[PDB]
Amino acid sequence: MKHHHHHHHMVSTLKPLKIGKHTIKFPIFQGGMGVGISWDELAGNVAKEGALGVISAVGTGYYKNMRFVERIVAKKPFEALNFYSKKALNEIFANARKICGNNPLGANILYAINDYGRVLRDSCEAGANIIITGAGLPTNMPEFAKDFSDVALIPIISSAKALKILCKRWSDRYKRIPDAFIVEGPLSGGHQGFKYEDCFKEEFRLENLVPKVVEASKEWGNIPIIAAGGIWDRKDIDTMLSLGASGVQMATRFLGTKECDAKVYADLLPTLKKEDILLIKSPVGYPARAINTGVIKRIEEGNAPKIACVSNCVAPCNRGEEAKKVGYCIADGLGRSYLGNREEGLYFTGANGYRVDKIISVHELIKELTEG
Ligand SMILES: Cc1cc2nc3c(=O)[nH]c(=O)nc-3n(C[C@H](O)[C@H](O)[C@H](O)COP(=O)(O)O)c2cc1C
Ligand SMILES: CN(C)c1cccc(NS(=O)(=O)c2nnc(NC(=O)c3cccc(Br)c3)s2)c1
Ligand code: SF4
């Protein structure tokens, strides 16, 4: 009909997904994306379409060019209190709800942080239905959630081993177990939960990981398993569901939508070639998949931005130690990209980023992924 709109019906054979007390109409999460990539426009429109919109809680101090920070040094949010800004996260959630209303929303918060519990509690207070946490083994998420018993809790893992450990440790100390698990494979965007040399080993392809995680989940009552990393279209979704996943998490396709809150990607992705997608070191301590542009090119030229830890974004870096060793500050680079700086920004992508040709709307994307 040329153009399908929000008043238009659509038939799907995908089934609604229950995560804790929350139901989403389609078994699809839009993966959280920092810094400033999945905020109110992206996540609110995803949730409007009946998938899980996920607000990234990382680097919210950059929102609206540090509208909600108390102190700025060298155009950066000062310390973790301002880098993970409570007021900004509150405004981002409120603005997403103007679009999606009470439709469920997640908040994504990396475990490797100073202040993890504070940011989790902030996300709950901002109205998140679901907390999603990777980049670490999040054995204590219920510690910080106990005043918000409706919020569902979802660790991101990269092995069946981690599922077993997390369930044991949660069950023993909180008499609770996770509401779902996301298993993230090595074709994903952002940071990988694998050493570099394991990111190319067939052992660790997502289709091998999913059955193992689903099997481990059986002992604990068939906790829903969400497959993530390299899922591009409905064919890949169906493959993962047929392997026992209850749903999928997808990010790179949404990075290529109009509603993405980091507007640079709409310019950058249509030009992106596969040869310019690489795995680089990160001050977070896991490999990161990046676009060979911006600060990465400036480092090679010997023009790298100066490093001085202002935002104190992640504990493994030790206030700049690791940033200086790997050559860049991830907070500074991602914030610059959100602010539109093509020369010194840092840009991330899944392995599939080169397949983005046209920038489409979230509505059109969900229609593509769910029809039939
Ligand atoms: C640009 C970008 C930024 C990301 N940032 C985060 C992040 O901050 N936290 C996180 O848990 N995952 C992050 N991810 C991972 C995604 O949420 C998702 O799990 C993954 O990219 C899915 O693989 P796909 O991109 O091939 O669909 C990011 C991914 C991309 C592409
Ligand atoms: C150990 N372990 C389960 C583990 C390890 C690595 C990846 C995963 N998979 S993942 O949690 O989905 C993520 N992928 N990319 C991420 N990026 C960020 O957190 C981040 C993004 C932007 C700024 C900043 Br400062 C941090 S987090 C799991
Ligand atoms: S120097 Fe390290 S801890 Fe400080 S903001 Fe940059 S990457 Fe984060």
Automatic annotation (TrEMBL):
First and last residue of the signal peptide: none
A GO term for molecular function: metal ion binding
Residues that coordinate or bind FMN 1: G32, G34, N108, E184, G189, G230, Q249, A251, T252
One Pfam family matching this protein: NMO
Positions with a binding annotation for [4Fe-4S] cluster: C309, C313, C317, C329
Gene3D superfamilies associated with the record: Aldolase class I
Chain positions recorded as FMN 2 binding sites: G32, G34, N108, E184, G230, Q249, A251, T252
InterPro entries reported for this sequence: Aldolase_TIM, NMO
Transmembrane segment boundaries: none
Residues involved in Mg(2+) binding: Y354, D357
Keywords: 4Fe-4S, Dioxygenase, Flavoprotein, FMN, Iron, Iron-sulfur, Metal-binding, Monooxygenase, Nucleotide-binding, Oxidoreductase
Record-given protein name: 2-nitropropane dioxygenase
